[PDB]
């Protein structure tokens, strides 16, 4: 769920607040359209697409599904006690949190005008 994804980011990127990623480029947070503006935006685009895929599973709601995961000593793991929905969503989240950690953050791309720039 979003609370858990929140916590995954705090684990892999303890250097910046989670709100930094909540409204960035065309794909991070609300939007899902247009040309991804940079590497970080591409992380989010893959993440958004991943959620759309997981939504194909009966009764699977990525923002609300509670999965089983761990974050300790620099390692993020999705656990074995996840069903197919939970396992897919956990994996989407984990791969994005990993993506975020390796991607440059450009202040210019924060809170951009989606209507004008993400067509």
């Amino acid at each position: 769920n979003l609370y858990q994804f929140k916590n995954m980011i705090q684990c892999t990127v303890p250097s910046r607040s989670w709100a930094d990623f909540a409204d960035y480029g065309c794909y991070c947070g609300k939007g899902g359209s247009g040309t991804p503006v940079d590497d970080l935006d591409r992380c989010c685009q893959t993440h958004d697409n991943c959620y759309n895929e997981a939504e194909n599973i009966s009764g699977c709601r990525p923002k609300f599904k509670t999965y089983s995961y761990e974050c300790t000593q620099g390692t993020l793991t999705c656990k074995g006690d996840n069903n197919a929905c939970a396992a897919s969503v956990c994996d989407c989240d984990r791969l994005a949190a990993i993506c975020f950690a390796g991607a440059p953050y450009n202040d210019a791309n924060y809170n951009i005008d989606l209507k004008a720039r993400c067509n």
């Binding site: 979003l2 609370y3 994804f5 980011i9 989670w18 909540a22 947070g29 609300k30 959620y51 923002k63």
Partner: peptide, 7 residues
């Protein structure tokens, strides 16, 4: 949760 949207 308790927020808007990060994903």
């Amino acid at each position: 949760v308790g927020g808007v949207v990060i994903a």
